Every structure is written in structure tokens, then in C-alpha cells.
Amino acid sequence: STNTTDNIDYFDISDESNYYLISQLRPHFSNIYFFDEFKRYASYHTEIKRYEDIHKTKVNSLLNEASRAIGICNRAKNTVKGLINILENPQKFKTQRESYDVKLRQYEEKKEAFRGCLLNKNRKNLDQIKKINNEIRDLLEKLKCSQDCQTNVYFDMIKIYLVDFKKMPYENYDTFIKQYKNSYLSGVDMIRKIEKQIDNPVTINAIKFTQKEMGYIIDRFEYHLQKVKHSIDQVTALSDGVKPKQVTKNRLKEYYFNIGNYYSIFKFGKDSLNMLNKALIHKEKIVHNLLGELFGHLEERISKLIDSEYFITESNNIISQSEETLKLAEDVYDKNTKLIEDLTLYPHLEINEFKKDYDNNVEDLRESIIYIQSYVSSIKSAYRYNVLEKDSVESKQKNIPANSNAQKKVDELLSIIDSISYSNFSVAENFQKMKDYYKEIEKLKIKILQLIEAIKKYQQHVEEL
């Protein structure tokens, strides 16, 4: 589906003074939008025809110089596009021989190289912009009224600007960047956890680079949205207002220059927000295309961990050996029990002194066997709690929606991997306990064999009485 990025013109740079912002979109300045709005301001005022003459010359010269500089750096845009379409896909990387790190370094150098070539050609047009602004100041101070002028272009064109402000959508962009940014930071939080378990570096380096680019485009979008909201608040804030009918001539000059600047910020911000919305949706689709490759390799890690952690086969080995020991000892007592029964009839008739010891041996026999049954019941009990700890994880794995759109399945698999990690402290202590008990079964096994030996020595002694 989507594996590449076609548009690059969201990249930009401002000046070192941060006063003028260049865009790679048309017409690269908000001041040109100011020049068109002051052209219609000069369509009002009959006295200033020199502005529309000059304005024709300046849109010609400025647009030609701008698109010229976009040509000279269009070749550098082709190189940077080459490194981007190397870095975004794994499939373009698997044919590539150089490792990832130096390619990332080359991406950095071509990036600031691109911004540097853009600004260094646009400086000579910035000086021309300063010339135009000074010519507009002189050309506006050509006119006549230095006492009361009127301030009908202000009181009308504000209402036209408010119609234009209610035309343009704000809340969908705001809700979009809030929900989207929440999904982005949640994404980076998923990457930091997902890096430790999955073994392949190539795909996760592609995702990490992609989220870096997403971070830059998010930062630009919050910048332009901030400029739009501030310009709307300033124009409507002047429309609240005290509404003076009378201004001085210089006050009229900074007056018109002021609101023309604000509406210029609105127009430039509109087109910038439009393009950045498209770019964020595209890169978001790239990220889902990558995680779609990732989660199939993730599930194998889960299927290894569930068998690996809960010590389940070793615990079944302990239970099998313990039940085998109980069956063995109970078999031996069932073998000797009639010989016990005769050798409880021989004591009470005669000299009881050795038979006191043998009575102690019989009590130790039956009490020992009852102890072994109690130990087996204890081990089986703790094993039951352990199996329950495993089965809750299995039910949590089976209750996932397939049916995830999008990338929430990776979040669910991280949740279940987090669950297997949480069971560790209870599982380890239960298994340690099982080891302790089986040691005590061993001790009672050596003791019970010495008991049956004591029974046989007693048996030959009673034959010797």
C-alpha cells in the first residue's frame, strides 16, 4: 500500500532574527499576502495608484526569484528524498550494504545542507522585502489627512475578515492534533518497551526514524495552529473594541499595516495547516504499515515466554517423583503389614524391653506415611495456585479482538507480556517451596528404609527368643 513519501515541502527555515519565515509552499512569505491585501486597500484609495504599479512589478520579481531558488534546491530535495526513501522502508535497506548509523548521519548533513541552501538564496529577496516595506511607508505617507481621517476601511474590512475567520475550521484541527499527539506519545512509549524483546534491528530503526519525522511535523503543526489562533484572537480582540472614529495619520499607517499583517498570518497559516494535516495522515499510515509487519514476530516471543516462565514441566516432574515415592512406600508397608500383625502378637506375652523400641518403630512408620501424604497434598495445592496463575494469562490472550484498527494489537500483546512478568514473584516462591518439600520427602525415604531394616532385625530377634 503506502511505502514512500511524495511531499517534502513541509521543510522550512526562518531567519537568524526569527522575523521572516520561509515556506517551501507558494508564495513562501505571508508578506506577499499582505501585498495583495494592501493592493485592495489601494483599490479603495484613489490617491495611491503607484502601489498597484509597483505591486505588479514586485509580485513578478519576487515570485520569479522564489521559484528560482526552489529550483536550485530542488536538486538537493531529490538527494534528501533519496535518503528518506532509503530510511523509511526496510526493503530499500535490505539491498543496501552500509549500516544504519552512518546513513542517519548522512541524513542529518543533507538536512541542514538543504535548509542552508534554501536560506542563502532567499536572503537577497529578503532585502528586497525590506525595500518594498519602506516604499509602502513612503507611498502611504504621500496622502493628505493629518487631522481626523475616517476609518471606514478598518470598520468594514474587519467584518469581511471575521466572515473569513468563521469560514475556516479550527476545532477539527485542534481535536485532531490533540488526539493524534496522544497516539504519537503512546507510540513512542510502545517502542521503548518493544525494543527489548523483539530481536530484529532494521524494522524498529525504520519505526524510530519515522516517529522522529512525526515529531518534527507535529512541532510545525502546533506552531502554525498557534499563529492562526493568535491572529484570530487579535483581530476579533480589535473588533471588541473601543472603536475610535478618529486617528492620526501615522496612527492610520500603523493601523492598516497592523491589521494587514494579522490577516496575512491567517492566510499563510491556513495553507500551512492544510498541507501539514495531509502529511501527518500519510506518515501515520506508514507507521501502521510497519507495526503490521512487527506484531507477527511479536507473538512468537509471547509463545516462548508462556512456556518458559511458569516452570510447569519441572513442577510436573516434582509431582511425578513425589507420587512415585508415596506409591513405593505405601507398597512396602502393604508388603510388611501382616508381619507387623504377627509381631504385635508376640510382644505382650513376654520380655517387652526390645519391643518398646519396635513399638516406637511402628509409630514412626505410620506417622511417616501420613506425613508423606500431607506433603504431597501441600505440593499439589501450591501447584494448583500456580496453574491458575497460568490460566488467567491464557484467557487474557484468548479475549483479544482480532478486529483491531489500528496498532492496538501490539498494545494488547505488550499488555500480556507485562502480565507474564508480573506473575514472577509468586511463581518463584511457590517453586522454591516445592523444592523444599521434595527434599523432605527424600529425608523421609531414607528414614523409612532404615525403619523397615529395624523391623527385619526385630523379626529375627523374636525368632531368636
Partner 1 sequence: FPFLAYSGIPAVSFCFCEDTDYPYLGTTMDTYKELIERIPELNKVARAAAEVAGQ
Partner 2 sequence: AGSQKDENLALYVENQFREFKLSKVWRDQHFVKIQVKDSAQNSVIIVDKNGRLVYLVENPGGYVAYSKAATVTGKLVHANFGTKKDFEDLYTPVNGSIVIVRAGKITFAEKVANAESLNAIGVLIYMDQTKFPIVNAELSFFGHAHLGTGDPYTPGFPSFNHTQF
- Residue (124 or 457) nearer to partner 2, CB: 457
For 364-394, letters b (16+ CB in 10 Å) and e give ebeebbeebeebbeebeebbeebeebbeebe
- Residue (213 or 389) nearer to partner 2, CB: 389
Give me the least distance between CB of 418 and partner 1, in Å please. Answer: 8
Q: Which residues are at the interface with partner 2 (CB under 8 A)?
A: 360, 363-364, 367-368, 371, 374, 381-382, 385, 388, 426, 429-430, 432-433, 436, 440
Give me the least distance between CB of 396 and partner 2, in Å please. Answer: 16
279 prior amide bond cis, ω within 30: no
Among residues 44, 155, 216, 422, the one that binds partner 1 under rule CB under 8 A: 422
Q: Are 184 and 215 in contact (CB under 8 A)?
A: yes
Helix axes 100-140, 202-238, angle to 10 degrees: 20
Using CA atoms, how far apart are residues 168 and 218, in angstroms rounded to an integer?
Answer: 20
One-letter amino acid at 184 equals Y
Among residues 195, 222, 323, 429, the one that binds partner 1 under rule CB under 8 A: 429
Give me the least distance between CB of 356 and partner 2, in Å please. Answer: 12
Using CA atoms, how far apart are residues 445 and 374, in angstroms rounded to an integer?
Answer: 14
Give me the least distance between CB of 192 and partner 1, in Å please. Answer: 17
- Residue 19 found at the interface with partner 1 (CB under 8 A): no
- Residue (36 or 412) nearer to partner 1, CB: 412
**Secondary structure class of 22 (helix, strand, coil):** strand
Among residues 418, 436, 442, 453, the one that binds partner 1 under rule CB under 8 A: 418
Nearest to 278 by CA among 173, 393, 386: 173
Give me the least distance between CB of 425 and partner 1, in Å please. Answer: 4
* Binding partner at 211 among partner 1, partner 2, none, C-beta below 5 to 8 Å by kind: none
Nearest to 172 by CA among 122, 103, 221: 221
- Residue 186 found at the interface with partner 1 (CB under 8 A): no
**Secondary structure class of 21 (helix, strand, coil):** strand
- Residue (134 or 426) nearer to partner 1, CB: 426
What are the angstrom distances between the C-alpha of 251 and each of 44, 180, 247, 277? 18, 44, 6, 39
One-letter amino acid at 419 equals S
Give me the least distance between CB of 429 and partner 1, in Å please. Answer: 6
* Binding partner at 222 among partner 1, partner 2, none, C-beta below 5 to 8 Å by kind: none
Burial group, residue 245, by CB count within 10 angstroms (0-12, 13-18, 19+): exposed
Size of residue set near partner 1 by CB under 8 A: 6
Using CA atoms, how far apart are residues 421 and 336, in angstroms rounded to an integer?
Answer: 50
Phi and psi at residue 164, in whole multiples of 5°?
A: -70, -30
* Binding partner at 388 among partner 1, partner 2, none, C-beta below 5 to 8 Å by kind: partner 2
Listed ranges 97-105, 373-381, 422-430, 443-451: which one lies at the site for partner 1 (CB under 8 A): 422-430
- Residue 183 found at the interface with partner 1 (CB under 8 A): no
Among residues 426, 433, 450, 461, the one that binds partner 1 under rule CB under 8 A: 426
- Residue 419 found at the interface with partner 1 (CB under 8 A): yes
The residues binding partner 1 (CB under 8 A) are: 418-419, 422, 425-426, 429
